[PDB]
Amino acid sequence: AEPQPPSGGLTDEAALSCCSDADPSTKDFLLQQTMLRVKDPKKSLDFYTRVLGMTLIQKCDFPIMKFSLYFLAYEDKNDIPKEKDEKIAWALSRKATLELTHNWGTEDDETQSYHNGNSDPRGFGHIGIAVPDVYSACKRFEELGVKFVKKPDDGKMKGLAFIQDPDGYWIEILNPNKMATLM
Amino acid sequence: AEPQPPSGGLTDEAALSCCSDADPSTKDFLLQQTMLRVKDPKKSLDFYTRVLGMTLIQKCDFPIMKFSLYFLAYEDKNDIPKEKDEKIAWALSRKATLELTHNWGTEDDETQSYHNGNSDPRGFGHIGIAVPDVYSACKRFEELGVKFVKKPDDGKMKGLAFIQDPDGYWIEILNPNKMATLMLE
Ligand SMILES: COc1ccc(/C=C(\CC(=O)O)c2nc3ccccc3s2)cc1
Ligand SMILES: COc1ccc(/C=C(\CC(=O)O)c2nc3ccccc3s2)cc1
Ligand SMILES: [Zn+2]
Numbered sequence A: 001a002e003p004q005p006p007s008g009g010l011t012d013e014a015a016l017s018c019c020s021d022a023d024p025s026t027k028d029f030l031l032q033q034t035m036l037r038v039k040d041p042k043k044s045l046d047f048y049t050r051v052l053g054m055t056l057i058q059k060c061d062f063p064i065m066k067f068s069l070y071f072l073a074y075e076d077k078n079d080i081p082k083e084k085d086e087k088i089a090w091a092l093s094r095k096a097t098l099e100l101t102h103n104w105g106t107e108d109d110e111t112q113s114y115h116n117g118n119s120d121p122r123g124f125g126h127i128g129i130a131v132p133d134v135y136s137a138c139k140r141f142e143e144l145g146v147k148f149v150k151k152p153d154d155g156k157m158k159g160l161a162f163i164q165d166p167d168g169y170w171i172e173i174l175n176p177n178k179m180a181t182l183m
Numbered sequence B: 001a002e003p004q005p006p007s008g009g010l011t012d013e014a015a016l017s018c019c020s021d022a023d024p025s026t027k028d029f030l031l032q033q034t035m036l037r038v039k040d041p042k043k044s045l046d047f048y049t050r051v052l053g054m055t056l057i058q059k060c061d062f063p064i065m066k067f068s069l070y071f072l073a074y075e076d077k078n079d080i081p082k083e084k085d086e087k088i089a090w091a092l093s094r095k096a097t098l099e100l101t102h103n104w105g106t107e108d109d110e111t112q113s114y115h116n117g118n119s120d121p122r123g124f125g126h127i128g129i130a131v132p133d134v135y136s137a138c139k140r141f142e143e144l145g146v147k148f149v150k151k152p153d154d155g156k157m158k159g160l161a162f163i164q165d166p167d168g169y170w171i172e173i174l175n176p177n178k179m180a181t182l183m184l185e
């Protein structure tokens, strides 16, 4: 192949040609969790449960290695099994869970903070919550003192916001029905 | 409050006391997406579709700003609407989607790579796929040339693996039914 001018995006045809159908060995795979490290689980738990309305579905403590895992999800607390074995199997088979990792001590270290991936070095950008109404969700967020990266009507793309959690991780607030207009 | 010995993390009742019930204004909120930046969408699309079995449910191009968004999910392709507007609304209301961001040109810069958050500076660690059988999933991964951070029987916690995607992002491979046994161990 001879050298080509700067490509640009992939075309739809190009992207589609890079995609294979799902092998039957993957048919039961599910995207179960996204893991973020948190400095202070008290502030993180208050933010994800009170501000965003998630439920704590599982807490795991590792006394020797000195860390805790918190699993948050949009689940009715009435569906949490009472028996601890059944609870962990149910929690870790939920789609779309958020795993917070607390390395014991980070809440007592004034020089410690995690990196949100949205400045050098970049990688992870954000989690995103679909909401029925971005403007009313963001008005409530304002009233609860939530720090904003992008208010819904600031920047080029109207109807879409970014807030941050107590560690500074970016959270997109989007309305699926308004994303078509943004194209 | 008097000074305390080094914190042993939260007790169950401490953690529970930091949790509020869900305000009715949040009742229809859902955890829709996790966004990772990818150097090369050809490699990333091949990895997430062929190796992990995800479906590309939406591609978005921004020709002036020069980036593309790829939405991947575990969805039956027969459920993807045919009409573009319905398709985007359906795609972006799916739970548990992966959004890959391609900043045009990164695939042509030999000194460029993204950071996976698992060395300084740390933050994000991983996504995780629940599978029926970690050992058979990982045997297949080996045969497809997938790079491993943790083989299922290496390290202290057996029955759990970590692979990496073409950018070096960590992906946990777990069996929900085997995570209970890991607590007692
Ligand atoms: C930090 O400021 C912004 C403002 C807008 C965006 C645009 C986004 C979010 C993203 O890149 O993840 C858009 N997402 C979609 C999804 C579908 C269709 C259009 C858009 S624009 C991103 C960052
Ligand atoms: C990179 O090596 C490892 C090895 C084991 C682990 C343990 C994990 C994964 C994680 O921290 O997310 C465990 N997760 C759970 C979840 C529920 C119950 C037990 C465990 S051990 C993590 C990284
Ligand atoms: Zn996004």
Ligand SMILES: [Zn+2]
Pocket: A033, A035, A099, B126, B128, B172
């Ligand atoms: Zn994990």
